[PDB]
């Protein structure tokens, strides 16, 4: 029933993602000195510190908006990878599976609570 519970649930999921070794390439914006052509391929950079900062600033209205930004981290890694077997892309696939497994109930509970609110 709680329309606000998604926020702390997302904060706790972000804490687990930060503890995950697979999140290391995605914890801060991609370094353009390391990947000089990054912005030639990627239009909208995104990383987990920016997602956490947006959430803590009160700049997400719903967990769907947070989920769109986290999915953008993974789609950027898929678009920038030179190979489907690269180390960083392989880490992104595992982290994506972990994130999707945990965000599903957060989205479901929020949408259910909102439908109840508008009944
Ligand atoms: C640094 C962000 N990033 C790197 C890749 C592939 C490197 O093999 C995808 N995203």
UniProtKB/Swiss-Prot annotation:
Task: Give residues where Phosphothreonine occurs.
Answer: 44
Kindly list the positions at which Phosphoserine occurs in this protein.
90
Found, by tissue, as follows: Expressed in myeloma and epidermoid carcinoma cell lines.
* Cellular location(s): Nucleus
Q: At the top level of its lineage, which domain of life is listed?
A: Eukaryota
Which segments constitute the Bromo domain? 1-106
Q: What does this protein do?
A: Probable regulator of the insulin and insulin-like growth factor signaling pathways. Stimulates cell proliferation through regulation of cyclin transcription and has an anti-apoptotic activity through AKT1 phosphorylation and activation. Plays a role in the regulation of cell morphology and cytoskeletal organization.
Self-association state and partner proteins as the record states: Interacts with IRS1 and IRS2. Interacts (via bromo domain) with acetylated lysine residues on histone H1.4, histone H3 and H4 (in vitro).
What disease does the record describe for this protein?
A: Chung-Jansen syndrome: An autosomal dominant disorder characterized by developmental delay, intellectual disability, autistic features, anxiety, hypotonia, obesity, and dysmorphic features.
- Return the protein name: PH-interacting protein
Organism of this sequence: Homo sapiens (Human)
In the UniProt record, what gene is named as encoding this protein? PHIP
């Amino acid at each position: 029933y709680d329309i606000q519970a998604w926020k702390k649930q997302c904060e706790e999921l972000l804490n687990l993602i930060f503890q995950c070794e697979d999140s290391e390439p995605f914890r801060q914006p991609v370094d353009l000195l390391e990947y000089p052509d990054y912005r030639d391929i990627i239009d909208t950079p995104m990383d987990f510190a920016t997602v956490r900062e947006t959430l803590e600033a009160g700049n997400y209205e719903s967990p769907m908006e947070l989920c769109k930004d986290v999915r953008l981290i993974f789609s950027n890694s898929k678009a920038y990878t030179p190979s489907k077997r690269s180390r960083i892309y392989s880490m992104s696939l595992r982290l994506s599976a972990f994130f999707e497994e945990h965000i599903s109930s957060v989205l479901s509970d929020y949408k259910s609570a909102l439908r109840f609110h508008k009944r």
